Amino acid sequence: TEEQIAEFKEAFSLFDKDGDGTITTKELGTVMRSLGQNPTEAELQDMINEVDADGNGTIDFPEFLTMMARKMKDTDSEEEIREAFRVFDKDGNGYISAAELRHVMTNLGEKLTDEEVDEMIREADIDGDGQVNYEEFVQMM
Ligand SMILES: [Ca+2]
Numbered sequence: 001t002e003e004q005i006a007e008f009k010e011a012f013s014l015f016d017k018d019g020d021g022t023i024t025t026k027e028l029g030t031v032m033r034s035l036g037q038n039p040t041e042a043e044l045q046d047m048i049n050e051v052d053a054d055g056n057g058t059i060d061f062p063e064f065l066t067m068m069a070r071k072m073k074d075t076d077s078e079e080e081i082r083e084a085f086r087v088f089d090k091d092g093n094g095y096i097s098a099a100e101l102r103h104v105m106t107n108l109g110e111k112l113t114d115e116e117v118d119e120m121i122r123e124a125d126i127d128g129d130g131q132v133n134y135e136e137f138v139q140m141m
């Protein structure tokens with residue numbers, strides 16, 4: 001929509017120091033260093049390349065818009081998976097145990113045994129710690 005675009009155009013403007021309608025490796029360098037980040041010229045060219053679809057060596061507003069729109073979908077998606085994880089994790093210690101899973105399953109209408117739930121933890125527990133971490137949760141969804 002019109003309103004959504006004018007929001008991304010402000011962020012775009014922040015990068016485009018010169019107001020010429022593109023973001024350059026050096027301009028992106030200036031912003032990233034405002035945020036306390038290094039970065040090398042090599043790393044900078046890579047960030048540009050990942051967004052510069054026409055391949056003329058800078059980023060234009062349409063490329064910026066297309067990128068930001070996919071990031072916008074990744075952000076929301078990440079924050080929804082994160083919220084579900086926090087609900088399964090009762091003590092908020094960063095790990096979902098068997099008792100926590102069984103307790104949530106029970107509320108979801110599924111009365112499982114500890115054997116059954118220990119099997120579900122084992123199914124997602126890649127690292128074998130005995131409980132489910134965040135990436136495993138994201139991967140298991
Ligand atoms: Ca993505």
Ligand SMILES: [Pb+2]
Nearest residue numbers: 006007010011
């Ligand atoms: Pb604003």
Ligand SMILES: [Pb+2]
Nearest residue numbers: 016018020022
């Ligand atoms: Pb510029």
Ligand SMILES: [Pb+2]
Nearest residue numbers: 053054055056
């Ligand atoms: Pb072009």
Ligand SMILES: [Pb+2]
Nearest residue numbers: 054060062063
């Ligand atoms: Pb273009």
Ligand SMILES: [Pb+2]
Nearest residue numbers: 052054058060
């Ligand atoms: Pb371009």
Ligand SMILES: [Pb+2]
Nearest residue numbers: 089090095096
């Ligand atoms: Pb926990």
Ligand SMILES: [Pb+2]
Nearest residue numbers: 098114115118
């Ligand atoms: Pb158990």
Ligand SMILES: [Pb+2]
Nearest residue numbers: 125129131133
């Ligand atoms: Pb694990």
